[PDB]
Amino acid sequence: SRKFFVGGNWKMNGRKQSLGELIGTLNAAKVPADTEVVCAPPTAYIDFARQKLDPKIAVAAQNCYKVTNGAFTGEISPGMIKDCGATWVVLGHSERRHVFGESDELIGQKVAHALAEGLGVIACIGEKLDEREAGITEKVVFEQTKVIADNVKDWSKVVLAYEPVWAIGTGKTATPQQAQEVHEKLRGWLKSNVSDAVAQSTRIIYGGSVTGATCKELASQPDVDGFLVGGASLKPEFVDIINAKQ
Amino acid sequence: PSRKFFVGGNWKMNGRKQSLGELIGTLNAAKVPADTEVVCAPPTAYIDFARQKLDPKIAVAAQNCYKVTNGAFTGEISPGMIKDCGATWVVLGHSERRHVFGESDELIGQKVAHALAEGLGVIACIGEKLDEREAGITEKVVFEQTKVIADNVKDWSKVVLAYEPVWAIGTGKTATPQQAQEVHEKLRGWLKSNVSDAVAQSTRIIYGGSVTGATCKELASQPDVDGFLVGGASLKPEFVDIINAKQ
C-alpha cells in the first residue's frame, strides 16, 4: 500500500538558531515506520539543514531551474541540490505559480530535468477561487496534472500535492470531504491516463491547511496519502501531523 | 577621498562544492591589492559554504533576495538569511532577474529598500537592451532604472551602481572604453543633479558585460569607471588580472 508522506514546507522562514532548535525537535521525534518525512528549508539553508538533520528525515529544495549550469543569476540546479545531499525538489508550488508567475510549460521542463538528474519531485497543482466558482476545478487540476505527467517517465519518484488555492486567505475553507473529492478524482485520472499500477502506488498529498487538530480526519480519507504542510511545519505540532495515521 | 576600486565576481548558476572549492583556493592564494574591494556572489545553495572557505579579504554576496524578512514565499531568501550566512552584499536588479524572470522595477526598488534596512550592501544593476540601444533611448532607460533605485536608497555608502548593457552580457561584445565612460559620466551627472554632489563623487559606478583580462586595463583607466562586475571570467584564473587592473 502507498507509504504515508508528510512534507514540511518551511517557506521563507527561519535562521540558523531557530532552525537548529526545530531540527533538534525533529531529530528527537520517533517517526512512524509507515511514514516518509521530508523537510524543505529555505535555499540558503539546504546544506545546513542536511548537515543537522538525522538521516531518517529527507531534505527538499523549495524550487530549482531546468539546466545543470548556466547564466541564471539567483537560481540553483538539481545538480547543486544533490550536491548538498538533498533528494527532493518541490515544483509548481502555488506561490511560484501565482506570486512569481511560473508557467505550466516552465514547470513541466523543470520536472523533466529534475527527474532526469535523479531527484524526487513533489509536483504541486490546484485551482484558484474564481476557477472553483466557475465550475472548472476538474479542468484546471487535470490540465496541470497532464503537463506534469507528460514529463514523468517513472512515477516511483513523484508525489502529487493538491493545493486548494481557493481556500488561501480568501474567506472560504476546504472540508475533508471537499479534499477527498479532488484526490479521488486525481487517482481516477492516473488510472485512466497512465495505468492502474500508478494510480494505486502514487501518493497524492493534501496541500491545504492542516494542523494537529485536523490531520487525523484528513488522513483517514481513503484517497489522501499525506500532506504538504505550511505553518505547522515550523512547530512541534509538525510531529502530531507526522503521527496522523497512528 | 578617492573612490575605492571595486571588483565583483558573479558566479551565476555554476559550480559544486568541489569545483567552487578549487576556485576559492586560487582566490585565497591570490595577491589582492589594498584599495581593491573584492566581492564574490556564489549560487544561493553555496553562500554559507563560500563564506566558510573564502579568506576574509574577499566579501560574499547573494545573487538575489526578496523584500520582507520572513513569509509565505516558497523558493525565496531574505536579507536576514543572507547576513546569518556571513555574507555582506546582495546583487539586485541583475539582467537575468529582470529579463528571464520578469522582475519589475517596482519589485527591485522594494528589495533595495529592505536590503539596506537590514544592513546589507547592495550591488544595484541597470542597463539597456540591444533594441533600446538601436532606438537611441539608452539614457532614458538607465536614468529611469536609477531613479527607482535612488528613490529606495537612504544611505549611498552601502551601494554600488552596476551598469551592464544587456547586449554585452555573455556575448563577448564588451563595451569599448568610450562607450562605458560615456554612460558612467551621464549616470554620475544624474546622481549629482538628483541626489547630491557628495553622492556623485563618492559612489562607485562599475561596468559589467564581457569584462576580460584583455579588456580590463583600458576600461579601468577611464575616470568614471570605478570597477567591474564580472560573470564568465570570474570563474577563470584571469579574474585575478581583473582584480589587478589598476596596478
Swiss-Prot record, chain A:
Record PTM N6-methyllysine, positions in chain: K191
GO BP terms: canonical glycolysis; gluconeogenesis; glyceraldehyde-3-phosphate biosynthetic process; glycerol catabolic process; glycolytic process; methylglyoxal biosynthetic process
Q: Does the keyword Transmembrane apply?
A: no
Q: What is its EC number?
A: 5.3.1.1, 4.2.3.3
Write down the chemical reaction(s) this protein catalyses.
D-glyceraldehyde 3-phosphate = dihydroxyacetone phosphate; dihydroxyacetone phosphate = methylglyoxal + phosphate
Q: Which domain of life is it from?
A: Eukaryota
By its UniProt entry, which InterPro entries does this protein fall under? Aldolase_TIM, TIM_sf, TrioseP_Isoase_bac/euk, Triosephosphate_isomerase, Triosephosphate_isomerase_AS
Which residues are reported to carry the modification N6-acetyllysine?
K11, K153, K191, K235
What is a single Pfam family found in this protein's UniProt entry?
TIM
* Keyword annotations from UniProtKB, A to Z: Acetylation, Cytoplasm, Disease variant, Gluconeogenesis, Glycolysis, Hereditary hemolytic anemia, Isomerase, Isopeptide bond, Lyase, Methylation, Nitration, Phosphoprotein, Ubl conjugation
Subcellular compartments: Cytoplasm
| Keyword Phosphoprotein assigned | yes
> What are the annotated GO cellular component locations?
cytosol; extracellular exosome; extracellular space; nucleus
Glycyl lysine isopeptide (Lys-Gly) (interchain with G-Cter in SUMO1) cross-link, renumbered residues:
K139
In the record, which positions carry Phosphothreonine?
Answer: T170, T211
Q: Where does substrate bind?
A: N9, K11
| Sites bearing N6-succinyllysine, chain numbering | K146, K153, K191
Q: What are the Phosphoserine sites (modified residues) in this protein?
A: S18, S77, S103, S156, S195, S209, S220
Question: Major location, coarse class?
Answer: cytoplasm
Disease per record is: Triosephosphate isomerase deficiency: An autosomal recessive multisystem disorder characterized by congenital hemolytic anemia, progressive neuromuscular dysfunction, susceptibility to bacterial infection, and cardiomyopathy.
Please name the HAMAP family in this protein's record.
TIM_B (MF_00147_B)
What function does the entry list? Answer: Triosephosphate isomerase is an extremely efficient metabolic enzyme that catalyzes the interconversion between dihydroxyacetone phosphate (DHAP) and D-glyceraldehyde-3-phosphate (G3P) in glycolysis and gluconeogenesis. It is also responsible for the non-negligible production of methylglyoxal a reactive cytotoxic side-product that modifies and can alter proteins, DNA and lipids.
**PANTHER family per record:** TRIOSEPHOSPHATE ISOMERASE
Instruction: Give the multimer and partner information.
Output: Homodimer.
Name of the molecule in the record: Triosephosphate isomerase
What is the taxonomic lineage of the source species?
A: Eukaryota, Metazoa, Chordata, Craniata, Vertebrata
Question: What gene name is given for the protein in this entry?
Answer: TPI1
